[PDB]
Amino acid sequence: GNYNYLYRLFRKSNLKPFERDISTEIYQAGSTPCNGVEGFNCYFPLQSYG
Amino acid sequence: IRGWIFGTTLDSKTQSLLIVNNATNVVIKVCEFQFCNDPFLGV
Numbered sequence: 001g002n003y004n005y006l007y008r009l010f011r012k013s014n015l016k017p018f019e020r021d022i023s024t025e026i027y028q029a030g031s032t033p034c035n036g037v038e039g040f041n042c043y044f045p046l047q048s049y050g
Numbered sequence: 051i052r053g054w055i056f057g058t059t060l061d062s063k064t065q066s067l068l069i070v071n072n073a074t075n076v077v078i079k080v081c082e083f084q085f086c087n088d089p090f091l092g093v
């Protein structure tokens with residue numbers, strides 16, 4: 001599995017045409033705010049293709 | 051008035067367009083700049 005190519009897995013809204021998002025903010029899936037730490041409803045936004 | 055900053059958080063966490071016109075040089079950058087609490091340029 002290769003670890004060099006990633007893709008954005010979560011986003012609260014869809015991208016506009018030709019928009020480029022490379023932010024690594026922890027996606028908040030719940031109501032509780034993530035403080036940079038992963039956990040329940042707090043996941044890393046990028047995933048590797050492998 | 052010598053420049054403009056465009057973005058969402060302006061805190062190096064996202065990309066922010068920076069336009070500065072210094073005398074005769076227009077400079078445009080899209081770097082992840084770390085801006086001050088109150089950005090300004092001194093004379």
Ligand SMILES: *[C@@H]1O[C@H](CO)[C@@H](O[C@@H]2O[C@H](CO)[C@@H](O)[C@H](O)[C@H]2NC(C)=O)[C@H](O)[C@H]1NC(C)=O
Nearest residue numbers: 011012013014015016017019020021057058059
């Ligand atoms: C660009 O950034 C703005 C500001 O965060 C996004 O607008 C927000 O979108 C979320 C949902 O994704 C809403 O809950 C917020 O209320 C919106 N805030 C404002 C001020 O509009 C906007 O969606 C982003 N652009 C894209 C394409 O996602």
Ligand SMILES: *[C@@H]1O[C@H](CO)[C@@H](O)[C@H](O)[C@H]1NC(C)=O
Nearest residue numbers: 070071072073074075076077
């Ligand atoms: C304006 O800033 C740029 C960026 O460093 C520099 O290269 C250029 O010489 C500056 N011009 C003036 C007139 O200060």
